[PDB]
Amino acid sequence: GCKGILEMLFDMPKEERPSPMYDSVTYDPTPNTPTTVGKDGIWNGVDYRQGSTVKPYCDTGPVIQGSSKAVCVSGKWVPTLGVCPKMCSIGSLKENGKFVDVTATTKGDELNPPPREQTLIPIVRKVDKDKVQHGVKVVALCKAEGVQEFECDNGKWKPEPVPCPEP
Amino acid sequence: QGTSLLTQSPASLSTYNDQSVSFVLENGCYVINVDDSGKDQEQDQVLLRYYESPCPKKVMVNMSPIKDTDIWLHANDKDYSVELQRGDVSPPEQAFFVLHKKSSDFVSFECKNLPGTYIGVKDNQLALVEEKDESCNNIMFKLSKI
Ligand SMILES: [Cl-]
Incomplete structure (x- = not known):
């Protein structure tokens, strides 16, 4: 055993x-x-x-x-x-890159679908929409061609953001 | 029927009135105390073991303190009490309660062999109680992550 x-x-x-x-x-x-x-x-x-x-x-x-x-x-x-x-923070990426918007392009349940047995017992969990699962992809905006893609890798966004030019 | 899968999860166990279900060494062995002193509840988490059982559908749940995952909550029918039992003596199949989901994420635990008898709270301790003889909240608990 x-x-x-x-x-x-x-x-x-x-x-x-x-x-x-x-x-x-x-x-x-x-x-x-x-x-x-x-x-x-x-x-x-x-x-x-x-x-x-x-x-x-x-x-x-x-x-x-x-x-x-x-x-x-x-x-x-x-x-x-x-x-x-570890999860990554949407707001942290928006801040480090000086982005005008950051929107998730994949859901955590795609790569990491919850097992059915997780619905068997209601365990209360803290919810924080600012956090995205490891492996989730997002797209950030600068407000032409100012669109940058990022992936959450164990608490760190990949790649490093090119900060947006000053409007 | 095939063999049902078995799942385990850690959780913090508390009462309806938000009192901690905690575990303390008393004369060498762990006892269950219902505490409202605000102490840190990290060390007093429980390890849940649960699976589905076909019912002529039922969620069976077993609970161990993370302080000693070799012991678990057990319904003592000869004393009408809730106690901790170690696996070198008490059989594990007799160590699962029937989960009932209540409102607002609260749950109740029914004795598998004593229908209508539930885990309840009496005098800062866990006891066995009759559902009809108690208010709803007496048998209502909450499982919380972290
Ligand atoms: Cl042991």
């Missing part, structure tokens, strides 16, 4: 955990797994069944610096799971 992803994380001090934290973690049973919880289930109260598949979800974007899914093999999750990325 394998210790669960969140159990591993909450065994270490808060300063040693990745930030941000996974929003949810879903475990897929092998075809031979009879029950969801039990001595032969996905979870037996101590650890998680061998061959189970794990898929973390981050509301900040698709995971970075590792794999999006892993399998329980020999007490370890292989390959190494990715961690949650």
Whole structure:
């Protein structure tokens, strides 16, 4: 068996955990797994069944610096799971580039669709429309040909903005 | 039916009147306290484990303090109380409550084996209560991120 992803994380001090934290973690049973919880289930109260598949979800974007899914093999999750990325700030880009407008061109659920299991329990979350998920693309304006494209990469906009000329 | 997927998420657990459900070491073991002193609620988060179960449709939810994810809330029918139990003794299948969604993102937890009996609040502690014998808000809790 394998210790669960969140159990591993909450065994270490808060300063040693990745930030941000996974929003949810879903475990897929092998075809031979009879029950969801039990001595032969996905979870037996101590650890998680061998061959189970794990898929973390981050509301900040698709995971970075590792794999999006892993399998329980020999007490370890292989390959190494990715961690949650940081979001980027629309207002920060508008300010650093002196842009007149910044509009998102993709939604976070395109690259990072929420699992169905996230609707099972209402967990209250802070909403901040100024933040966009990792991997979301935007377009900024200068107010001819003054249109620049940007991508959110783990809290940083790519590429660096060419600040608009003084009107 | 196929085997239902199992999901886990951290959350902060609070009551209807916005009191923290916290965990404190008492004589060596963790107890559950309903606190309204304003202390930081980060260390007192819970680890939720939940899955769908076909009902003749039901969301089953299990709850552990992040301070010790090897123990979880459990309904004691021999004392009519809410306690923490460790997985080397108590079976995990008996450790899931039936989630009921209420208004304004509040939820309630019904005992799987004691229909109509819910997790409630009595004297700054969690207890088992009868839905009809209580007001709505007595069994209403809120799960919040961070
Ligand atoms: Cl233990």
